[model samples]
Target: GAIEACLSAAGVPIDIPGTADYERDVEPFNIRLPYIPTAIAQTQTTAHIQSAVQCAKKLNLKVSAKSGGHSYASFGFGGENGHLMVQLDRMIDVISYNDKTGIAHVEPGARLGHLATVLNDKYGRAISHGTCPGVGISGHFAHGGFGFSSHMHGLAVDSVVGVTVVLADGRIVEASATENADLFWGIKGAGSNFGIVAVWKLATFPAPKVLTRFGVTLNWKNKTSALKGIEAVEDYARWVAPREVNFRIGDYGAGNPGIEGLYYGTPEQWRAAFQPLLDTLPAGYVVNPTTSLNWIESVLSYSNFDHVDFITPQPVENFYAKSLTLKSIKGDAVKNFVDYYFDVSNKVKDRFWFYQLDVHGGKNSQVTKVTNAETAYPHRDKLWLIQFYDRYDNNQTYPETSFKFLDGWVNSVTKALPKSDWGMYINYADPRMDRDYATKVYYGENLARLQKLKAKFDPTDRFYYPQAVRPVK
Candidate 1:
């Protein structure tokens, strides 16, 4: 009650309890792990973001922002409550584009699909980002925003040329490679740990005229073919895949697994690039009929929507997910991982879960070409980025046993390799991890510099979350 009074007295608007928008504003993307903030300031501009932080400082409250509200652990609302939630949902916009520089000026709340459509349709420009339609630009770009096109375009972080941010101390500052360079580098990966980004100037590329969208499905009759199939894809991707093509391997339920993505060329070009992969597969498999997509169509294909006018709604699902970045997964490692999954995960039927192994890096990867010194994202040297997800039934309380099982599932995979050879993706954070462990895995060699930035920018830890960078005094 006292904190609410301080917030309101400071001229910071509050989504007070018992109000119409309170519940809706505090609702997180992962409905299974909900949070209740002391107050939520639905910020409309950079000024509002600054005011929210200033008031939070006055009241000695933690602060977080909800751009897309898609944090796997509800980090946007400070992960766990009693913080000031600055909602940027009202600031969604593509204010301008510089044709000369190929940079698009976008607001924090711009959703990926809508942003993709606008950048492609209006300016014939596009930037590499996630495939998910509803995810916001801020959090996605803040972490390493890897998508189907990342192998070619690098990532959303790599595309960012500049930004306007409100720091923990309530100062609005502009950052780029030449100005406030260290802050710019720090924001590239672990941005939420630093401040609230209001605007981004992202470098864009000419929208491809056509994308040869392709897929290959292997309906494994048994474990024999399944292990071999996975190994074959991994080998081809690691050694022979082209930068022009990006893809992911998937396993939903169990028997049938698919590898699908898009190629930046004609069907014949796709066939030529994919021929080596095709030669290694087992007897029975299927492929997506030779399909082609333009810029908007490739963006729309995943979300199953034709129109982009609607402001994409926040996706509320009862789910948890985790990720891993590995240097290699040989035949033995692959075999062990698959065996553990099939034996343990196959028996469980309560939750709906899926796993994905995307092509993050290889000999032909642009993602790997960028040095670690260029950005705070440290997994550039790794080849495979694996994601595992479990979604509970709506309104169902998740079982600890189920959640704990996947934690060990990932551990089993990592155990097969050297500890130094593996890393974690901050975007797909697992709440089960302690903050220190999370930071070490996500930052690795970059952690020390990040901590120094944390001390310099936010010694009081105003921009706080459970997984936030802990400042060193």
Candidate 2:
């Protein structure tokens, strides 16, 4: 009664708990994040966002804003029960775009796929962002949005020029390089911790007229061949590939090894880059040729984005997903990893699982060019981001052995390297991680300043989660 009373009085409409809209708004993408928020603020404007936060402050409740509602940790729903969830779904809008300046103003709820379509169809402009169309621009852009185009354009955060934000104390401030600069810096990497971003000001890129969507397939029937394929592909990726080439070695619960990539140059140049690896591949492995696609076709095809249901992904599983950013990949380490996968097959059987090795820092990569000082995201120099993910046998269940399964893979790959050779990615957060370890790996050298900003801007910890930056105070 008290909570809803405060929010409504402040002119922020809210959905009562367990109502149809409330239930839909609270649905978790990750089954592990089943937290039911105290109330859902159906916010449509920045003022609505402000009122929600202000009410939360006066009423002694925590606040969280859900943009795409794709938060892995369910931070979108306050990451825990009994908090106010400022729902920004109605805020989804492409406010404006300037063709001459190549700048776009997007509301918080505007999804990546929608933005991609509008920018491509109307203005021939695009932003470097993730493939999933359903992911909201706000959260994705704020916390280091990496994509296939990141090799050329830099992470989604890099394109952000400014944003209108609602602060913890109910103040609306415009954040950018020139105004409230510190808050702007902190939000780029750790936005959810500082405030709720209302609308983003982005410097968009010219959408490529033509590009090659390439997939190289290799069937490593046995452990021996798989090891060879891993080494050969890694060798080319780390040593010979060009900045114009973007790829990842994908194993989506399929034993066969394959490459899914985007090439920004000529098809011949794309073919030339893979030829050396093809020559080294086990004789029977398959190599896929490039497919030419226009700007929208490449992205939409990659995401299989025709249907609305696909874009609006529902809760997938009771799963455990972990990430590691390796500065270098060693043969011995890869061999150890492949051997374990082969050895565990009998017990593991066929389950819903996948691994993606998003190539980040090979030739002239743009993601690494930005200095850590430019934004709070610290892992600017990582070479490879390896995502090891698995869905449980049951939708609502996760086993203790699952933790060991993923952790073992981490150790398997890193067995030969020194400790500092790899770190974790914040975007692929592990909920099991405590604040100290999560903060250490995710923010790295940037954590100190992030804490300072957290203390300065949000001393009362109005915006918070278990792994949020702790206020230095």
Candidate 3:
């Protein structure tokens, strides 16, 4: 009405309707990719992301691009009046996949699950992507994508051979090691805020045919057993040599009343892999174990858990999520954390707090074709990443409590350790700190370089966000 009125007041004859609906709708997903916002803006149009400054100038509006709303810091969702959200989901298209070169051109909106489905369907290949199908490829790769296959493939960022992005000034460009050296350095991890990336050309791989799932449970019947079980799994780090075959293991903590170990690989390999773990958690303790499935099927099984048909992408979904950094943990610390976690879980008995820690290094430590190691993703040498999961419900009180528990637990655990802690992932952002955390948490050493690139590409700060690579103010 207001827009039509303005046009009418300007001597333009226009018919006014009681309501106007938009063409595009920004679906709000709570943290878990399930819960969503009640109100939605339906009358919107999708556009290929361009330079923020150019977009702002062209539309005379503030422009922001979001590939994955998984930005727990809420960077991808908020802006001022006339905020034009450049959702890049429509832009995701695989330009090409070359096995000889081991690379593929992936749009910023492309994520692991869809990409995996596409690669497998088209070329019978796959990339080492995150476990969650909902994870956007850009955020995953830009922040260093890791997964069960990482021990064989290295971080996901290491697969990118090139990138095409639009600067804040509306300039189209590409970044690579040999060209635009500085931009290439910054974009690997901090690309979201520096510019609008159109596509990421990543190295691809031959899709695995068969994968076996092996799981062992250590019921949290007692704290002693839980602590020993946790240490036994953590101890597996000792065997992760760089040359090891495709292997990965996940240790789900006793955040609830049970803890479990999940491994992916051949039956023979996993049998050998879990040898040490068996010394602590024997065969009788195994709970809900299945072996043998196609690689994609195994991924689907792990993520959806018995919902094979739900793998289809439903863009219109509500979800919310939050995550934290795990600096370090010892047996004693694990026990303390387990006690606090379970105590909190008991308070919010409805939601499940599935916690897990992955064994790191091995393939992740090897040198790769891509220079992703130069970015803010700095945990290549660490033993594992501890993560907590909670499903969101709008009317529930437990989400807040779980958030508090995880955040407080992380802070308590990290503060007790040395200042030179393990790395924090950009995907799992927390706003407890100031915007400088983009630098402090992920790219401490390369902040100066990233800032320089940010200045060059977005000096006007048009591409700014709380989790952005900080440009000069």
The candidate scoring highest on TM-score is 1
Candidate 3 residues 1-473, lDDT tens each?
33333333334222222333212224334433222221222111122244333435544444566565556554555422234455555445677877788678877777567787777778777777677776677767877776767666677777777888777766788889898877876777676766777778887777777576655555545556666666665555545333333333333333333333234456776677556656765234554555776767867866754432222233432222333344346744676666765565445555444555655452333423234346545565455665655554555543444566566566555655665554566666554566775457666455666777787777767765555666663
**In candidate 3, residue 122 scores what lDDT?**
84
Model 2 misplacement above 4 A: 308-316, 345-347, 393-396, 414-416
The lDDT of each candidate is: 0.84, 0.80, 0.57
Per-residue lDDT of candidate 1, residues 1-473 (tens digit): 76567656666667867776676777788888888887788777787788888888888899898888888898888888688889887677898999899988999988887788788878999888898887878999998899888887888899989999999999999999899998999999989988999999999999988798898887776778877887787788889999888998887865568888889899889989998988998768887687798877888776655665336465488887989998887755677777877787677677788789989988888899887778899998888999999898777888766777677679778778877888899889788788899898988788899999899988999987878888985
Return the clash pairs for model 1, or none.
none
TM-score of each: 0.96, 0.94, 0.80
TM-score of 2: 0.94
Q: Could you tell me how far off, in angstroms, the CA of residue 352 lies in candidate 2 after the best superposition?
A: 0.6
Clash count, one per candidate:
0, 0, 15
The number of the candidate with the highest lDDT is 1
Give RMSD (Å) of candidate 2 vs. truth: 2.1
- Please identify model 3 stretches exceeding 4 Å from their true place: 1-24, 31-48, 51-53, 58-61, 79-82, 240-265, 281-284, 305-327, 362-373, 395-402
